[PDB]
């Protein structure tokens, strides 16, 4: 649970990690976006594309 009268949150970074709406009395936990990158594995330009 959060504070009785708290509004937002945060995490290790400056990013927030909480939201409150007593109407829904909701509590959540936040994480960074999935995130992704690409790496290419090529035998060689002169061997095969």
């Amino acid at each position: 649970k959060f504070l009785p009268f708290q509004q937002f949150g945060r995490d290790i970074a400056d990013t927030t990690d909480a939201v409150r709406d007593p109407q829904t009395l909701e509590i959540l936990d936040i994480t960074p976006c999935s995130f992704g990158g690409v790496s290419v594995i090529t035998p060689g330009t002169n061997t095969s594309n």
């Binding site: 504070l3 009785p4 009268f5």
Partner: protein
């Protein structure tokens, strides 16, 4: 506890916010005196709290 001043640890949380442009340097608590209907032989009056 035995002593009014504590030794444990405890934080605080926000309560309210009243906006007014009035300087504050000294305050005064208010005391309410309950009316006492003493008998004639009591010979007591003047203050009660």
């Amino acid at each position: 506890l035995v002593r009014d001043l504590p030794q444990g640890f405890s934080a605080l949380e926000p309560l309210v916010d009243l906006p007014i442009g009035i300087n504050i340097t000294r305050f005064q608590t208010l005391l309410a005196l309950h009316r006492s209907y003493l008998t004639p032989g009591d010979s007591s009056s003047g203050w009660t709290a």
